[PDB]
C-alpha cells in the first residue's frame, strides 16, 4: 500500500459485468430438433403415429 493519496491517480474506472450469452447447447442440435413445450413441472405424454403396409 502506498502512503500517499494514490486514489487521486485513479482517473478511470472500468467495470466488467459480461452479458447473458446464448447457451452453448444450441451447437449440439439442429434448428429443427428443438421445439418448445408449455409446462413447468410434472409429466407430458407424446404420441408417435406410425403406418405400415399389410
Amino acid at each position: 500500500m502506498e502512503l500517499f493519496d494514490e486514489n487521486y491517480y485513479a482517473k478511470a474506472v472500468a467495470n466488467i459485468i459480461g452479458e447473458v450469452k446464448d447457451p452453448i447447447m444450441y451447437k449440439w442440435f439442429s434448428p429443427d430438433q428443438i421445439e418448445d413445450v408449455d409446462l413447468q413441472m410434472g409429466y407430458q405424454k407424446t404420441v408417435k403415429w406410425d403406418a405400415f403396409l399389410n
Binding site: 446464448d22 444450441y26 451447437k27 434448428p31 428443438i34 418448445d36
Partner: peptide, 28 residues
Amino acid sequence: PINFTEFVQAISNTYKQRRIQFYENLKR
C-alpha cells in the same frame, strides 16, 4: 407489459427469438 405473467411471456418470446437468430447466424 401489464403484469408479471405478460412479462414472463415476453421474456420467453425474447429467448425464443434469440435462439432463432443464433441458429440463423450460425455457420458450421
